[PDB]
Design an enzyme around this catalytic site. Sequence first.
Site, mmCIF file in Angstrom:
data_model
loop_
_atom_site.group_PDB
_atom_site.id
_atom_site.type_symbol
_atom_site.label_atom_id
_atom_site.label_comp_id
_atom_site.label_asym_id
_atom_site.label_seq_id
_atom_site.Cartn_x
_atom_site.Cartn_y
_atom_site.Cartn_z
ATOM 1 N N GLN A 11 43.897 42.639 39.656
ATOM 2 C CA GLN A 11 43.976 42.879 41.111
ATOM 3 C C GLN A 11 45.253 42.314 41.770
ATOM 4 O OE1 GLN A 11 40.518 42.547 44.014
ATOM 5 N NE2 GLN A 11 41.856 41.037 44.953
ATOM 6 N N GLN A 15 48.165 44.748 43.354
ATOM 7 C CA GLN A 15 48.385 44.708 44.802
ATOM 8 C C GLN A 15 49.782 44.223 45.187
ATOM 9 O OE1 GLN A 15 43.828 44.815 46.523
ATOM 10 N NE2 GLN A 15 44.767 42.760 46.422
ATOM 11 N N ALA A 96 36.747 41.347 33.606
ATOM 12 C CA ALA A 96 36.681 40.131 32.818
ATOM 13 C C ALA A 96 35.849 39.015 33.450
ATOM 14 C CB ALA A 96 38.081 39.662 32.497
ATOM 15 N N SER A 137 47.854 37.296 38.034
ATOM 16 C CA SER A 137 47.353 36.002 38.510
ATOM 17 C C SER A 137 47.134 35.077 37.308
ATOM 18 C CB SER A 137 46.025 36.173 39.250
ATOM 19 O OG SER A 137 45.016 36.710 38.413
ATOM 20 N N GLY A 141 40.256 36.698 35.205
ATOM 21 C CA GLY A 141 39.938 36.881 33.794
ATOM 22 C C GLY A 141 40.886 37.877 33.144
ATOM 23 N N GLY A 143 44.009 38.927 34.773
ATOM 24 C CA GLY A 143 45.328 38.369 35.034
ATOM 25 C C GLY A 143 45.720 37.314 34.021
ATOM 26 N N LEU A 249 68.255 41.245 32.300
ATOM 27 C CA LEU A 249 67.119 40.342 32.112
ATOM 28 C C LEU A 249 67.490 39.117 31.314
ATOM 29 C CD1 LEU A 249 64.084 42.710 31.609
ATOM 30 C CD2 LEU A 249 64.631 41.414 33.600
ATOM 31 N N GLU A 251 70.323 37.489 31.342
ATOM 32 C CA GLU A 251 71.063 36.583 32.211
ATOM 33 C C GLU A 251 70.164 35.615 32.955
ATOM 34 O OE1 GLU A 251 74.261 38.669 34.489
ATOM 35 O OE2 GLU A 251 74.634 36.662 35.317
HETATM 36 N N1 LIG Z 1 48.729 36.565 46.169
HETATM 37 C C1 LIG Z 1 47.648 37.254 45.810
HETATM 38 N N2 LIG Z 1 46.679 36.645 45.127
HETATM 39 C C2 LIG Z 1 45.633 37.468 44.844
HETATM 40 C C3 LIG Z 1 45.492 38.808 45.160
HETATM 41 N N3 LIG Z 1 44.274 39.286 44.703
HETATM 42 C C4 LIG Z 1 43.707 38.248 44.143
HETATM 43 N N4 LIG Z 1 44.484 37.118 44.175
HETATM 44 C C5 LIG Z 1 44.225 35.829 43.512
HETATM 45 O O1 LIG Z 1 44.016 36.066 42.132
HETATM 46 C C6 LIG Z 1 42.994 35.177 41.628
HETATM 47 C C7 LIG Z 1 41.850 35.993 41.091
HETATM 48 O O2 LIG Z 1 42.437 36.883 40.131
HETATM 49 P P1 LIG Z 1 42.412 38.470 40.281
HETATM 50 O O3 LIG Z 1 43.751 39.087 40.164
HETATM 51 O O4 LIG Z 1 41.771 38.853 41.617
HETATM 52 O O5 LIG Z 1 41.468 39.023 39.127
HETATM 53 P P2 LIG Z 1 41.729 39.855 37.799
HETATM 54 O O6 LIG Z 1 43.089 39.456 37.279
HETATM 55 O O7 LIG Z 1 41.687 41.300 38.093
HETATM 56 O O8 LIG Z 1 40.568 39.479 36.778
HETATM 57 P P3 LIG Z 1 39.026 39.883 36.755
HETATM 58 O O9 LIG Z 1 38.788 40.697 38.099
HETATM 59 O O10 LIG Z 1 38.240 38.561 36.831
HETATM 60 O O11 LIG Z 1 38.709 40.707 35.507
HETATM 61 C C8 LIG Z 1 42.672 34.230 42.781
HETATM 62 O O12 LIG Z 1 43.480 33.057 42.688
HETATM 63 C C9 LIG Z 1 42.990 35.085 44.005
HETATM 64 O O13 LIG Z 1 43.362 34.271 45.103
HETATM 65 C C10 LIG Z 1 46.563 39.454 45.885
HETATM 66 O O14 LIG Z 1 46.637 40.645 46.200
HETATM 67 N N5 LIG Z 1 47.600 38.578 46.178
HETATM 68 MG MG LIG Z 2 39.685 42.551 39.712
#
Ligand SMILES: Nc1nc2c(ncn2[C@@H]2O[C@H](COP(=O)(O)OP(=O)(O)OP(=O)(O)O)[C@@H](O)[C@H]2O)c(=O)[nH]1
Ligand SMILES: [Mg+2]
Length: 434
Positions: A11, A15, A96, A137, A141, A143, A249, A251
């Site tokens: 996510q 995003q 995840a 992230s 899970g 990320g 990249l 550099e």
């Molecule tokens: N800066 C930012 N942080 C985000 C965003 N969406 C989620 N987070 C952060 O990401 C973390 C949660 O990870 P996610 O990216 O939402 O989840 P995922 O990587 O899809 O993993 P799972 O959904 O658990 O399978 C938390 O620390 C959230 O605050 C976004 O659009 N921007």
């Molecule tokens: Mg997600």
Amino acid sequence: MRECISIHVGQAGVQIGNACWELYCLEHGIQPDGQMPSDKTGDDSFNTFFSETGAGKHVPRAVFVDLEPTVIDEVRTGTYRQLFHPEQLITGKEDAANNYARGHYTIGKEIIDLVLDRIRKLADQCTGLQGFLVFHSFGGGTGSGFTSLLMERLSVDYGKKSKLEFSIYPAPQVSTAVVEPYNSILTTHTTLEHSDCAFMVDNEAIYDICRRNLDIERPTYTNLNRLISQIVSSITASLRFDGALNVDLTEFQTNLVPYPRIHFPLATYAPVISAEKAYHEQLSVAEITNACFEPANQMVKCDPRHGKYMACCLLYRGDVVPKDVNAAIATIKTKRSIQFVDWCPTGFKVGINYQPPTVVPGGDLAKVQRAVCMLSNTTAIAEAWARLDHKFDLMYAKRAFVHWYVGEGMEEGEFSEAREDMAALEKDYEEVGV
Ligand SMILES: Nc1nc2c(ncn2[C@@H]2O[C@H](COP(=O)(O)OP(=O)(O)OP(=O)(O)O)[C@@H](O)[C@H]2O)c(=O)[nH]1
Ligand SMILES: [Mg+2]
């Protein structure tokens, strides 16, 4: 040629990816359908990030991956539904569930081959692939787990290619899981030898900037991501506009990473001005350069006066006169609380992109005449590793939540091996810091 492939995992990755590609299109004059009017020379500098079809359609060299479909479905039906091809947007059925072990082992294994196949299709369209930019992230899970699996597989399949990261560091003011300190340590351990340079984005720092400089009482992910994309664009501009600094990249590693494991540069950006405040007198080169040493403008919460510098790059964009930059840097070498480590060259590397900085129409950031992103490799960033490690330690002493990981493939010993590697990383910083 010198192409770069961007990979957005989970996510946060997807995003932030949306915000980045929106901004890249605006900067290069590409429409949401991929078409472009004027251009004129193949010889277009942005061809490093966008491929060109026979119809004249400019397609991002991007892959979007998520283990569940809700976030990527919004991309598939939104404003940029015609920008990316459907094959570049990959989704699973079950996420995840904030578990690194599901992302890496049990659920990630089901989609890794398909993701690599799609990456290969983009790589085949390249005549001089530089490498990859990986957005994810630390906390999720997907990320955490899926990124580390993909980084491992890309090091085998593209051994000679550079890999850079844009990592979302967790914050309680912006958080989703109690287990995020575990996922953060687990992904850092398994990605460390597979990443050349990683830009950490602390969600608390971004949250604080939005509240303090953009006067946004309660920032949403949209507000946070528009600020992150502005900083990411400042870092990747050199790769998209053919400058003189960080043109490839490779550099990034050469200029910012003298010690391979210590590959986490601090990004500081200025000026962050609210669109919904009637501007004022435009900030000079000296003012925006001085703002680079103001802790409030950092992407990671830490005190650089407590740390030592290994490398420092200043990336200017807009109405920036080279003599004005030279005068600004000369002042920083005088009024110096800027201490460099034992065996590092002590110089500041400078880049100037003359295009006026670009902002999203209907965004929170005001259009400025001149902006700067400072990339500094400082030992002060170890403070962020210490915060994560302490949280990991509190829970791990009781083995709280460890059953979730053990039940999803993973060996208990992996937690200890990962934590010991973090302890060695903290020691690397401490050894350099003296
Ligand atoms: N800066 C930012 N942080 C985000 C965003 N969406 C989620 N987070 C952060 O990401 C973390 C949660 O990870 P996610 O990216 O939402 O989840 P995922 O990587 O899809 O993993 P799972 O959904 O658990 O399978 C938390 O620390 C959230 O605050 C976004 O659009 N921007
Ligand atoms: Mg997600």
